[PDB]
Design a protein around this ligand. Structure first.
Ligand SMILES: *[B]([O])([O])[C]([C][C]([C])[C])[N]C(=O)[C]([C]C1=[C][C]=[C][C]=[C]1)[N]C(=O)C1=[C]N=[C][C]=N1
Ligand SMILES: [Mg+2]
Lengths: 250, 212, 233, 222, 240, 244, 231, 235
């Protein structure tokens, strides 16, 4: 046995292209549309719950994932690759930061660690790149609210707002017209729902849409009282009912 | 054990005793404490018998490999440093060695290096090593000069071992003499202390304390 | 390095004209406590060898499994496993002797003294000793522990040298062994009355005797012994 | 604490003749104050006209002899059935012994045979591999009793010629195989009288150009 | 680990990876070595395609391995650093254990041995570098000049060149260099080295580097003006 | 077995070139142009972000200019993810040198170390090389202000003024024309921006499409200050030089 | 064709070509003959020379006092395998005080060669071996092929033109098996068997190589003027 | 591509066969064994006149009683020589004696096939190992990269090998003297060499029981060349 693939499976072609990264990006293009919008007092991330079967319980599959109490993530592309990335991202937030500094990492540095993992899959022996693009929304004390995109190459860019996947080209154009630097969180959620409706074919409701926010601290979601400095997670996943309420005022 | 080696006009004199002991028990009186590394290098042994033989025998293999690779005989400095670096790897493990690496080369001339199982490596003109070293030093220091004849230098070395063989309980048996020159070492025989003592006493007029 | 916990005492043995006898009591001691009263310390290997083991019982059980496994392994791809290529006492011993010395050399010994008794293919008697240190020796009589001090003297009165072996019958040899076992019961504080005895004869094969007892003991004279010197009543 | 060493007693003796060599050893094997065996062979024929004995801790002794016998076998395989000379065997044994420098074979080794000129040869070893060719060597428990007798009766030490009074030494005349065996037997009888670990039997191996011959003699069994 | 056999034999008995490593040397800038009676000179080409360079800090072509030995090269620049570093370490290691600086032959033998090792080790390609190693042995006034190449073979040279258009400058040296009477002085040796480079170099401005090594650890690199004086004198004599 | 699928990243062409190095350089030739200009009283680093968007958060973004220590900085050209791996290694290397010798690492030593790492990927391991070219701008008390560049081959060279990435041929010609040795930082700032403005593939050069930095002795007395320019500061210098 | 690049690849008909190519190396090798009776076992080998100045390549190797083999094919592979046997014979002696059974020695060689045919990177052994020995169940003769197949036989031959000697033994089966307590007559039958595989060249003094093992006969090799008796 | 340890359909290792082709391109080396000693001679073949020919070391000492000549990719031989020297010295350390020439050769040949995917390819060099021991006397061995070694009375390897071997076929007899063998090597070298044979482009050596292994001086060889010319012109 032994992993005898100790050589790179991603290499430069004569034209200077890294084929496997380009192909990974093509796999992301086929993936379901997901987006992110940054407001003044929060960030919103959203995507369509493309159910593979009506017998399947789409609540059990979580496209939007908590990484830290103040950082969340969503994707477009291959779901299984995303799932393992979330597992590694959650763990690296502890091992490379929280167990050292006694606090959760700021968004940009966690993103940097995720990016590193994805870069290594692009250069290390016997592996293909990850077939996903991530949108990581988060908050920290010194940088405030932020939104980052992470590609199969490991490259990451900060966005005011963006979209990835199926109808990203049209969605990004839609966001450019609507976005401004004075948006409140509720306004961003409203724009997120409008933008996402364009890329969705079938049913459009709280059960077919997954949406989470990075906003105010939620002391009700903390689980304990008695420590003033611990005020609760800024990440919150919106319920099926909470989405439908905003779809009536749409 | 008593071993000595000193530089002089006619090269180097090397002299050693022959006794080996296990506690108060005399294990051997015929031990070869000079090791012929090559036609120009000598090694004296003192302390642990096996440690000294094995590693000095081994040293000769390393010196041979040097001159095969470099098409040139090994220097006394390099030969001594191979041994000292080796024992230094084993420092703390309990090796017991006190040695002189004696030789002649064109670039160095006659050279003596004291090498030790503690890792000590010293260049010098005179050295005495072993349990009976202090007795040898007494005779050697009072009679040493640079301008000694090969004949007189040999006797001094022989006499210095005899002095120690007499007093030191763990030294004795017989005296092995070597003379190292520009053209290599020369063996000058095994001299039994049982016969050498009475010979020296009578001719030299020394040891008036003892009755004979 | 360990210390023995549950222990077995003397194993005694001797050669006779047509084979070998070996015996060992059925006790597993726990220090001064005579804890286990049904321990078999003679372990037959095939129909031509018996391994008698003293010392640590947990290590004895390990050795027991090694021998059991040795028989299995010998049978593999061996059409003559029950004939020409069957396990010999000399093979079984040398294997143990290798293991014992290897384990002592790793400073983690099997805390035992072992006597391998048997009969070879050519009818020759086999009797050899090995212990935790890997020390091996053979003799017309062999014994471990207290047996070495008390059994051997008695057994050597029967077979004092090699030339006495053909002169010693199985009845005389067995009688000497059974007597030695009684003596050990009188004088070894970590022995029991119950014991096992094995005879490996070149003609009648392996005879394994269980549930033997020390009998014909002399105790009556105890009634006359009073006090420790001056006392009369 | 586990003590990996033991003392199996016994005593061995090698003597080098002019065209022969002998290696003798008692056959008693012991622990503390008990006899294990009255006849446990201690001197072995290792092939190539070499005899060997590793006296002291028997388990290490047997291990060493076993490994040397193995070394002779592989010397034949690797070097076209060449005969292992006694001097080469001695150097090989040094490396076996010194190989376990920091966990030694607790034995006093002696080998005997013939050198490449056909003369008798005895080599003696300490536990950690220091060796030396000798005309005469006793080893083991009663070595302290026997060696002085051999210095006197083999090398004629402290012996002078009558009439001269200390001036002329006794000449070092060679000893025949019959003369050597007498000295061996008296050495062991004397050792048996004053050493409790020596007795039962004496086994002598004699090496000549014709091969390896054995001789056995009874010793006191007390 | 990556264990792939990259350097292997072909049906015609050639190791192409070693031969292609020589082609990389052929591409590299020209280097020349000339030994006089009491000196050795190492000439090196600097291609003038690269201007706006900072000549203070740019890695020099001639590298000191010890105070008495120097190494120049032709071929891949990045590869040469690995050989130089290893050589420099071995030079100090030799002084530490032998208590004597390396001979020029020994240092060459080591560098050549490293190059060879890379021609039959798994997962590695050969060095695309040929070196000229020059200097003076300790307490010795005899000049030394050695060459190595990717295959691992090495040999001593009265004079030698490597790199691009080395065929031309070797042609020049073969007719101009006399063994019975080599360049007696430093001037004569440097002059012959500059002359040989002028057959190939193009312009004699900043395209020629010269380094003179003399006995007893006496190494010095000539400046632009000093070299320019040689270039001037050569061409003025040529106009006749 | 696995041999079938091995690209063999570390081999020579018949011509004596390293395939993967050459192709990595082709990759870098499409990357945003980065320029370094060294002056007597400081160094300039200018670099063009690649086809940005209006929705890109510029003030928190960093794709071109990175800080290695207080004295040394780099401009990147190629894969950003690859560059960050090397940057973190270089940052550690500088700290190791500081811990060992209690002195800031000399620029060339740091540059050599990174260049040796890149070299390793071209000679052994069977992995693809890093598709990155650096411009190192730094200072130390030995050589003063220094500009270096390194590429995927692991070869590095020193420069007075240099460009990497796209349109380096056109960029180097313009720098070679207008550069002089007695030049100053303020003049070098202008040259850098003017060069990018002409070589850019974009319609017009604006503040949001640029990253800019200077290493000045322009700090209170004998010491060196690194200045990574903010979006508003890049906008001001573009107006000052008369480009917008 | 497309399925002979390495040992890890079955062909569409279920063949292992690298093993078959290794088998081919044996056929190119010089002829050697093996045969036994109830008391003795004999190896007879035709040694091959490079030219008239060269020596004749040795074909027989000793493994123990009671066992040895002859080789045909790559000699270095025979050295590796014979070295392995020497160790296994030796392990049996040191640990179990037991001479290794010839049948079991064949099983060990089979399993060693097999591992090389199923793993990637390695290669099959390029040599065939004829093992003879005398153990507790009498005289034995084995034929080893580098596919892994080991076979116990009364007599056999391997190498170039080995079919001639093999047919001869197949006819003589009833005669040579009965040659008990007579080593010279058993060798004669072996020398007469190998003669059937000769063309052009004949058996000379430095050409022929013979070995024998038996009841009271250690494994001994005969070369040079020692085999002139049998020419 | 294909495995390094692959067999051809004919039953040969591709890489071993290809290394043999590299050896054919190498410079000629000739060895001749006699009862008075073994002679080794080589073609130096300098690529240019500026190359100092005395630095070409294609004849090498392994021990005092064993010499060695090479042909092919001579850089590959260095690790083989180092192993040989170590084996020779190590055996002397373990057994207090000289090592047999065959045993030394066998130790070298054990390296040969230690290649796979250990080193990445076979050696591209053939060796003529000449020496003397007490058991088998004066010996000459040819060690290939296949792991095989043949003993020879005389042997030529390198570019002019088959032509030289045919010449050695006729010329060699069991009663050759050392002086006759020396001239014979020089005669055959001169025949197969491209350039004209002299003391600078050709080297001699021998191994005798008394003096051991000796490389010949250029002054000593020059006399033997002059002695050769006269004896050929004599008839
Ligand atoms: B000498 O006294 O140092 C001597 C030299 C040695 C080469 C024989 N050493 C010994 O005699 C030692 C004991 C000793 C005594 C005094 C100081 C240091 C050491 N004896 C042994 O090494 C030894 C070896 N084999 C058997 C008995 N003794
Ligand atoms: Mg007694």
């Amino acid at each position: 046995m032994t992993d005898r693939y100790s050589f790179s499976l991603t290499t430069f072609s004569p034209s200077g292209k890294l084929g496997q990264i380009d192909y990974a990006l093509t796999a992301v293009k086929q993936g379901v549309t997901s987006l992110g919008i940054k407001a003044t007092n929060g960030v919103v991330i959203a995507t369509e719950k493309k159910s593979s079967s009506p017998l399947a319980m789409s609540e059990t599959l979580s496209k939007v994932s908590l990484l830290t109490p103040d950082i969340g993530a969503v994707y477009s592309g291959m779901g299984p690759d995303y799932r393992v990335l979330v597992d590694k991202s959650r763990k690296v937030a502890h091992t490379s930061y929280k167990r050292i500094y006694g606090e959760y990492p700021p968004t940009k540095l966690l993103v940097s660690e995720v990016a590193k993992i994805m870069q290594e899959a692009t250069q290390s022996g016997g592996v293909r790149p990850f077939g996903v693009s991530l949108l990581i929304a988060g908050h920290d004390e010194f940088n405030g609210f932020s939104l980052y995109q992470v590609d199969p190459s490991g490259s990451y860019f900060p966005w005011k707002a963006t979209a990835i996947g199926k109808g990203s080209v049209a969605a990004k154009t839609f966001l450019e017209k609507r976005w401004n630097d004075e948006l409140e969180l509720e306004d961003a959620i409203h724009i997120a729902l409008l933008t996402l409706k364009e890329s969705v074919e079938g049913e459009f409701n709280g059960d077919t849409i997954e949406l989470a926010i990075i906003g105010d601290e939620n002391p009700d979601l903390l689980g304990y009282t008695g420590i003033p400095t611990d005020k609760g997670p800024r990440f919150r996943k919106l319920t099926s009912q909470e989405i439908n309420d905003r779809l009536e005022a749409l | 054990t008593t071993t000595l080696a000193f530089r002089f006009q006619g090269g180097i004199i090397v002299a050693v005793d022959s006794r080996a002991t296990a506690g108060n028990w005399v294990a051997s009186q015929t031990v070869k404490k000079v090791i012929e590394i090559n036609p120009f290098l000598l090694g004296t042994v003192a302390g642990g018998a096996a440690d000294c033989q094995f590693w000095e025998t081994w040293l000769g293999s390393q010196c041979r490999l040097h001159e095969l690779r470099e098409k040139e005989r090994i220097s006394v400095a390099a030969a001594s440093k191979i041994l000292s670096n080796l024992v230094y790897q084993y420092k703390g493990a309990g090796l017991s060695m006190g040695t002189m690496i004696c030789g002649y080369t064109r670039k160095e001339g006659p050279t003596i290096y004291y090498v030790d199982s503690d890792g000590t490596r010293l260049k010098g003109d005179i050295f005495c090593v072993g349990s009976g070293q202090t007795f040898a030093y007494g005779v050697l220091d009072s009679n040493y000069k640079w301008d000694l004849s090969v004949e007189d230098a040999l006797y001094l070395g022989k006499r210095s071992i005899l002095a120690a063989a007499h007093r030191d309980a763990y030294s004795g048996g017989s005296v092995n003499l070597y003379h190292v020159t520009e053209d290599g070492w020369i063996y000058h025989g095994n001299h039994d202390v049982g016969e050498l003592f009475w010979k020296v006493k009578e001719e030299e007029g020394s040891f008036n304390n003892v009755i004979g | 390095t360990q210390q023995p916990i549950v222990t077995g005492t003397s194993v005694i043995s001797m050669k006779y004209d047509n084979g070998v006898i070996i015996a060992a009591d059925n006790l597993g001691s726990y220090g001064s406590l005579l804890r286990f009263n049904g321990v078999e310390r003679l372990i037959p290997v095939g129909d031509n060898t018996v391994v008698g083991i003293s010392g640590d019982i947990s290590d004895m059980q390990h050795i027991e499994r090694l021998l059991k496994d040795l028989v299995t392994e010998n049978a593999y791809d061996n059409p003559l496993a029950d004939a020409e290529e069957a396990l010999e006492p000399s093979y079984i011993f040398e294997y143990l002797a290798t293991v014992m010395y290897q384990r002592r050399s790793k400073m983690n010994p099997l805390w035992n003294a072992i006597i391998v008794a048997g009969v070879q293919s050519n009818g020759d008697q086999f009797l050899r000793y090995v212990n935790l240190l890997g020390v091996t020796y053979s003799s017309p009589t062999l014994a471990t522990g207290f047996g070495a001090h008390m059994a051997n003297p008695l057994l050597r009165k029967v077979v004092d040298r090699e030339s006495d072996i053909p002169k010693t019958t199985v009845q005389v040899a067995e009688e000497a062994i059974v007597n030695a076992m009684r003596v050990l019961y009188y004088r070894d504080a970590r022995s029991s009355r119950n014991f096992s005895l094995a005879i490996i004869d070149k003609n009648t094969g392996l005879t394994f005797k269980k549930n033997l007892q020390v009998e014909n003991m002399k105790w009556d004279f105890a009634k006359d012994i009073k006090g420790y010197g001056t006392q009369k009543i | 604490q586990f003590n990996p060493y033991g003392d199996n007693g016994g005593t061995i003796l090698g003597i080098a003749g002019e065209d022969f060599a002998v290696l003798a050893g008692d056959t008693r094997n012991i622990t503390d104050y008990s006899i294990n065996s009255r006849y446990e062979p201690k001197v072995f024929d290792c092939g190539d006209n070499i005899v060997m004995s590793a006296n002291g801790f028997a388990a290490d002794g047997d291990a060493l002899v076993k490994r040397f016998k193995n070394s002779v076998k592989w010397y034949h395989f690797d070097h076209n059935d060449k005969k292992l000379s006694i001097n080469s065997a001695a150097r090989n044994i040094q490396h076996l012994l010194y190989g376990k420098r920091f966990f030694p074979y607790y034995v006093h080794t002696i080998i005997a045979g013939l050198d490449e000129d056909g003369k008798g040869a005895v080599y003696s070893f300490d536990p950690v591999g220091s060796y030396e060719r000798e005309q005469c060597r006793a080893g083991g428990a009663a070595a302290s009793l026997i060696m002085p007798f051999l210095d006197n009766q083999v090398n004629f030490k402290n012996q002078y010629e009558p009439g001269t009074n200390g001036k002329v030494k006794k000449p070092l005349k060679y000893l025949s195989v019959e003369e050597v065996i007498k000295l061996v037997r008296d050495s062991f009888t004397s050792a048996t009288e004053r050493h409790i670990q020596v007795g039962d039997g004496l086994e002598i191996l004699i090496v000549t150009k014709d091969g390896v011959r054995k001789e056995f003699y009874e010793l006191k069994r007390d | 680990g990556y264990d792939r056999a990259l350097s292997i034999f072909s049906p015609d008995g050639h190791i192409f990876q070693v031969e292609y490593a020589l082609e990389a040397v052929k591409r590299g800038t020209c280097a020349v070595g000339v030994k006089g009676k009491n000196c050795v000179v190492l000439g090196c080409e600097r291609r003038s395609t690269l201007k706006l360079q900072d000549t203070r800090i740019t890695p020099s072509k001639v590298s000191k391995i010890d105070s008495h030995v120097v190494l120049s090269f032709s071929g891949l620049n990045a590869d040469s650093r690995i050989l130089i570093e290893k050589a420099r370490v071995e030079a100090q290691s030799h002084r530490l254990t032998l208590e004597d600086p390396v001979t020029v032959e020994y240092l060459t033998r080591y560098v050549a041995g490293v190059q060879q090792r890379y021609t039959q080790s798994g997962g590695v390609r050969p060095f695309g570098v040929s070196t000229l190693i020059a200097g003076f042995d300790p307490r010795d006034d005899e000049p030394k000049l050695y060459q190595t190449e990717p295959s691992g073979i090495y040999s001593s040279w009265s004079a030698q060149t490597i790199g691009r258009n080395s065929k031309t400058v070797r042609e020049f040296l073969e007719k101009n260099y006399d063994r019975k009477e080599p360049p007696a002085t430093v001037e004569e040796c440097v002059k012959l080295t500059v002359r040989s480079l002028l057959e190939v170099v193009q312009t004699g401005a900043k395209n020629i580097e010269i380094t003179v090594v003399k006995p007893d650890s006496d190494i010095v690199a000539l400046s632009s003006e000093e070299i320019n004086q040689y270039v001037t004198q050569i061409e003025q004599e040529k106009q006749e | 077995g696995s041999r079938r699928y091995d690209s063999r990243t570390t081999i020579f062409s018949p011509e004596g070139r390293l395939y993967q190095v050459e192709y990595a350089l082709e990759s870098i030739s499409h990357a945003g142009t980065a320029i370094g200009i060294m002056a007597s009283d400081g160094i300039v680093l200018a670099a063009e972000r690649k086809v940005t968007s209006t929705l890109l958060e510029q003030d928190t973004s960093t794709e071109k200019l990175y800080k290695l220590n207080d004295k040394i900085a780099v401009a990147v050209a190629g894969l950003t993810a690859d560059a960050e791996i090397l940057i973190n290694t270089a940052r550690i290397h500088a700290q190791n040198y500081l811990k060992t010798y209690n002195e800031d690492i000399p620029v060339e030593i740091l540059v050599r170390r990174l260049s040796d790492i890149k070299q390793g990927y071209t000679q052994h391991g069977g992995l693809r090389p890093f598709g990155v070219s650096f411009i190192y701008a730094g200072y130390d008390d030995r050589y003063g202000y220094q500009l270096y560049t390194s590429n995927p081959s692991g070869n590095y060279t020193g420069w007075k003024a240099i460009s990497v990435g796209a349109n380096t041929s056109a960029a180097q010609t313009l720098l070679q024309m207008d550069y002089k040795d007695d030049m100053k930082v303020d003049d070098a700032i202008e040259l850098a921006l003017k060069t990018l403005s002409k070589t850019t593939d974009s319609s017009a050069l604006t503040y949001d499409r640029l990253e800019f930095a200077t290493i000045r002795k322009g700090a209170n007395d004998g010491e060196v200050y690194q200045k990574i320019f903010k979006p508003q500061e890049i906008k001001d210098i573009l107006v000052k030089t008369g480009i917008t | 064709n497309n399925y002979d690049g390495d040992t890890v690849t079955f062909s569409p008909t279920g063949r292992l070509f690298q093993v078959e190519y290794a088998l081919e190396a044996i056929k190119q090798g010089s002829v050697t003959v093996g045969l036994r009776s109830n008391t003795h076992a004999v190896l007879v080998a035709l040694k091959r020379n490079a030219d008239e100045l060269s020596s004749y390549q040795k074909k027989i190797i000793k493994c123990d006092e009671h066992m040895g083999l002859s080789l045909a094919g790559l000699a270095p592979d025979a050295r590796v395998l014979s070295n392995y046997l020497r160790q296994q014979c030796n392990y049996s002696s040191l640990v179990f005080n037991r001479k290794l059974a010839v049948e079991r020695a064949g099983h060990l060689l089979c399993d060693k060669a097999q591992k090389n045919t199923q793993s990637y990177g390695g290669r099959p052994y390029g040599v065939g071996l004829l093992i003879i020995g005398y153990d507790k169940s009498g005289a034995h003769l084995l034929e080893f092929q580098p596919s892994g197949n080991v076979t116990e036989l009364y007599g056999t031959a391997i190498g170039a033109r080995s079919q001639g000697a093999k047919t001869y033994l197949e006819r003589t089966l009833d005669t040579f098996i009965k040659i008990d307590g007579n080593p010279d007559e058993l060798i004669k039958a072996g020398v007469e068997a190998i003669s059937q595989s000769l063309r052009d060249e004949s058996l000379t003094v430095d050409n022929l190589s013979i070995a024998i093992v038996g009841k009271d006969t250690p494994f001994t090799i005969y070369d040079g003027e020692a085999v002139a008796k049998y020419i | 591509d294909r495995g390094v340890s692959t067999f051809s359909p004919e039953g040969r290792l591709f890489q071993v066969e290809y290394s043999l082709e590299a050896i054919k391109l190498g410079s000629t080396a000739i060895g001749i064994a006699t009862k008075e000693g073994v002679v080794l001679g080589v073609e130096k073949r300098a690529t240019s006149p500026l190359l100092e020919s005395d630095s070409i070391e294609k004849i090498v000492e392994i021990d005092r009683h064993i010499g060695c000549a090479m042909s092919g990719l001579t850089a590959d031989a260095r690790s083989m020589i180092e192993h040989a020297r170590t084996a020779a010295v190590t055996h002397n350390l373990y057994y207090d004696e000289d090592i047999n020439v065959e045993s030394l050769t066998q130790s070298v040949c054990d390296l040969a096939l230690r290649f796979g995917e250990l080193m990445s390819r076979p050696f591209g060099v053939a060796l003529l190992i000449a020496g003397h021991d007490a058991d088998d006397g004066y010996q000459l061995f040819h060690a290939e990269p296949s792991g095989t070694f043949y003993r020879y009375n005389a042997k030529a390897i390198g570019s002019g090998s088959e032509g030289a071997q045919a010449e050695l076929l006729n010329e060699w007899h069991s009663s050759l003297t050392l002086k006759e063998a020396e001239l014979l090597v020089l005669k055959i070298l001169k025949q197969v060499m491209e350039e004209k044979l002299d003391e600078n482009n050709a080297q001699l050596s021998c191994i005798t029981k008394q003096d051991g292994f000796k490389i010949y001086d250029n002054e000593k060889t020059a006399e033997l060349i002059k002695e050769l010319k006269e004896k050929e012109a004599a008839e």
